[PDB]
Design a protein around this ligand. Structure first.
Ligand code: MG
Length: 580
């Protein structure tokens, strides 16, 4: 009974016609008086249909280059499916029917079965391409992760970037590869049984390459704005459809298994049906098993229970863990005490802030809502992600912060990867990578200069516009072969296999999970019909024997995994053990 708003017949942009008849070009403009399409250098006047809709059909095929001409001004297509020359250039006509998919026996992945592995295509490999990423898939499969989480792919200006400056949401960023290269990466992942998720940005457009207002200023509103751009007007149906058509393209046409929606608190909409709800309806209409996740700091269960999203990146856990290990207190970290009792509480509640006052200076308000409705998989936990690394002045990883030992780092992994919540890892985390993940960009002219100036002011700090900042963020695949990188990787492999194989850790019910502390020792207990597991993590700087930890139940006897491989039930400083 929900009916999609989308029909291929009326799709905006350039869409191949059936029967080899060519391509249908369509646009919406509220303000242009003359409207043409320029195809391979030749200008053709478009037909006015009313409602500001203009259309033309021509016998050109996939590969043809085009843009629109509005009152004589050549303007890129916001609906471009590929931009080989970047965001200020001609689009290419793409035919999604030509790729030979081999993934008919893949049927998606459930959230409760996800262990996400966050990839930035530009830094993940030396080449920085989909094709090179695809060659690392067997390594990821064997590692034991189950879903790749790809940072945004929408085209942005410059030769590198995180992806949050995406401006042409439908056009995969050309330096990473052509559309068929992205398709090949997803097909390969599926043939190995890995899911693939995409980070999409529906709260703002980047600062170069967004020509929507040239067509219709009413895509946007001055009613509100984000930190990152003018407000997207979700009261305007064409704006709603820009994002819901984009979501449907990634899932249907690229075979992604789900989307991660960036910064959902800033998708402001006062409409009767919120855009988040309509996104869920539109993706569900595809008749698959695709998932939607929200990156949302509000601790708002309604994203799941009302908007019908599948889960939420819920960072109170991350923050609590980092403050436990470092004691830091700048910015949002001032919201957390850290320590074993604090971490026991945040896990017990899923998130910490359920309506209590958030006292962080400049941000004060009553934050969050009761978490009771949410089940364990609905919470996506991490100890590292692109932001929690890259937002730091030097982009350092958790094991690289002052005062953090590799033992502590390995204990944190054990906690994350034995919890029933849905875990996410950042690329290279699993080998305790030596490289930072720094903020980098490559904007032109004055915008580029302002990025460099802005970064300098907000916090020596690496210049985001320098090539070296990008290169310094590249993964070094050699280093995992040896030393402590290899030892950390063996632990991650061991944790990921237990997560997959242990019949008690299969639990995904908060009803079966309890937590507590004794001094600086955290305990996390799971009890199901299959048995009992307890993770104990010594967050002190002394040694603690498991036998002397005071617990309100009888500790299990059998050692399943010790993060430092010890034979006896004793925890050196920062170490963890799983018993059963
Ligand atoms: Mg074929």
């Amino acid at each position: 009974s929900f009916q999609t708003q989308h029909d291929p017949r009326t799709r905006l942009g350039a869409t191949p016609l059936p029967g080899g008849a060519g391509t249908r070009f369509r646009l919406w403009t509220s303000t242009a008086r003359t409207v043409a399409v320029r195809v391979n250098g030749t200008e053709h006047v478009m037909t006015s249909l009313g409602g500001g809709i203009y259309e033309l059909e021509l016998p050109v095929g996939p590969g043809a280059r085009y843009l629109f001409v509005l009152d004589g001004v050549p303007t890129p297509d916001p609906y471009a499916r590929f931009l080989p020359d970047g965001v200020h250039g001609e689009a290419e006509v793409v035919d999604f029917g030509t790729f030979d998919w081999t993934d008919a026996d893949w049927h998606g992945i459930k959230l409760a079965d996800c262990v996400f592995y966050e990839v930035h295509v530009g830094t993940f490999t030396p080449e920085g391409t989909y094709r090179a990423a695809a060659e690392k898939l067997p390594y990821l499969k064997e590692l034991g992760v189950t879903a790749i989480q790809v940072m945004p792919l929408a085209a942005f200006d410059g030769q590198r970037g995180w992806g949050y400056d995406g401006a042409a949401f439908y056009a995969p960023y050309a330096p990473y590869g052509r559309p068929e290269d992205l398709m090949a990466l997803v097909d390969a992942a599926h043939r190995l049984g890995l899911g693939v998720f995409l980070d999409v940005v529906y709260n703002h457009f980047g600062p170069s390459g967004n020509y929507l207002s040239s067509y219709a200023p009413s895509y946007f509103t001055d009613r509100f704005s984000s930190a990152w751009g003018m407000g997207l007007d979700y009261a305007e149906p064409h704006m709603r459809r820009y994002v819901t058509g984009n979501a449907r393209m990634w899932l249907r046409d690229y075979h992604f298994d789900g989307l991660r929606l960036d910064a959902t608190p800033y998708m402001t909409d006062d409409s009767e049906t919120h855009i988040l709800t309509e996104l869920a309806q539109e993706i569900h209409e595809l008749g698959g098993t695709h998932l939607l996740l929200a990156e949302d700091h509000r601790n708002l269960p309604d994203l799941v229970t009302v908007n019908h999203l599948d889960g939420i990146w819920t960072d109170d856990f991350h923050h609590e863990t980092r403050v436990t290990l470092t004691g830091e207190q700048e910015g949002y970290y001032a919201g957390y005490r850290g320590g074993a009792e604090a971490l026991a509480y945040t896990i017990r509640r899923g998130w910490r802030y359920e309506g209590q006052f958030w006292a962080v200076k400049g941000e004060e308000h009553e934050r969050g809502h009761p978490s009771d409705a949410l089940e364990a998989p609905n919470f996506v936990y991490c100890i590292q992600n692109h932001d929690q690394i890259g937002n730091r002045p030097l982009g350092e990883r958790l094991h690289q912060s002052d005062g953090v030992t590799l033992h502590e780092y390995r204990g944190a992994a054990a906690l994350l990867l034995t919890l029933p919540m849905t875990p996410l890892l950042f690329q290279g985390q699993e080998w305790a990578a030596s490289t930072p993940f720094q903020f980098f960009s490559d904007h032109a002219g004055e915008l580029g200069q302002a990025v460099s100036e802005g970064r300098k002011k907000e916090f020596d700090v690496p210049d985001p516009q320098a090539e070296q900042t990008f290169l310094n963020s590249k993964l070094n695949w050699a280093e995992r072969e040896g030393g402590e990188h290899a030892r950390t990787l063996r632990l991650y492999r061991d944790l990921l296999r237990l997560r997959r194989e242990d019949p008690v850790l299969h639990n995904r019910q908060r009803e079966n999970l309890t937590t507590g502390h004794d001094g600086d020792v955290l305990w996390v207990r799971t009890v199901t019909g299959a048995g009992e597991r307890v993770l104990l993590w010594n967050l002190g700087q002394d040694t603690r024997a498991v036998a002397e930890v005071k617990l309100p139940f009888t500790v299990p006897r059998r050692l399943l995994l010790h993060t430092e491989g010890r034979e006896d039930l004793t925890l050196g400083a920062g170490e963890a053990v799983l018993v059963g």
